[PDB]
Amino acid sequence: VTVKDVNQQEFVRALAAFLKKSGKLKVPEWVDTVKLAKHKELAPYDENWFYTRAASTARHLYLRGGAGVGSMTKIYGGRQRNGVMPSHFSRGSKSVARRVLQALEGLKMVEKDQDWGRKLTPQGQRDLDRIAGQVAAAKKK
Amino acid sequence: MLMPKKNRIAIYELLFKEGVMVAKKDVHMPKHPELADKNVPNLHVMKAMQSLKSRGYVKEQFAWRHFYWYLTNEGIQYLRDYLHLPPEIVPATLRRSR
């Protein structure tokens, strides 16, 4: 495994947990309260979820040259039920993603990229690749 | 239509020198680009011109809300009189060609 080698769900699942063990990520004190998207029906069932998003994002950046919060809000953004009106896109929160981006920096997984947008760092690039291997290794099944 | 005895001169005098006038069909811009020692827009200029035309002296074409004003021969004499000016006058024709 390149991270590209591992399936997205298991990769994210494994990394997100690894982050949880590490114990040092950092977390707008909120996260209990927050929905994550105006579109959103209820907050996240796994109140633990902050880690999962972080993993998801780290993987998301590693794939691509550089990305920023607006893109993430939309990615997270689902369809919002206008009620009487037909449903439409609504890019998902900007505080969570930003905080995610800021926090990741602390670990050095990602760093400000040139010309705007955060890019993965070689430190992160190394870190993701390492867990990617661990996941591949676990088993067949 | 209505107006000053100074603005009227500005209109007549420019008209006599130009031989042509244009004004967009608006009564609000109050001022118009080009000339305009400023004071007006269609009105004083439109109205004065409209009056000038009714008595002859000028022929007016509307198209596209501009109103293009063309000075007539009888009119040249008339403005000649208002300006009082030097006979041979010589407004917005003089000319060469080929």
Binding site: - | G19, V20, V22, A92, T93
Partner: protein, 162 residues
Amino acid sequence: MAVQISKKRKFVADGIFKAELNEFLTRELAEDGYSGVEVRVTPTRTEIIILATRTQNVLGEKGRRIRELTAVVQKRFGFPEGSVELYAEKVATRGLCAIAQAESLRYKLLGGLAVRRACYGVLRFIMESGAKGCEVVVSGKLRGQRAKSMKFVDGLMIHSGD
């Protein structure tokens, strides 16, 4: 500097400009047999060639009316003096310029004349020019309460397609 303007907006703009111009001349040059215009962009001038066949009237005494027109076009199209320029130009045969023939009917009827004489005459003249065919329709109300229309055709014409 710029002053610029978008290429798409630019072309549409030019088209509208041509629409004004064509409308203005159509209304002024009527006695002139104004047939149509062509505006050619160049470097350092804008030339407007008026295809009309009564160019003598367009010219004017001592070279006049054309000047009076150029001046107008120049003033209205914020064309600083001298770039823009007007030229008259006789149209080859007045017989195949639908527009010349139409203006003619307007004049004949306005003149006072009859209906069949005017139409038939125009038709005969057009056919004499040696055209393919021609048709003139008069719609509207003459002398009475009720509207009526007439079709006066001679020769051959094709209705449909490219």
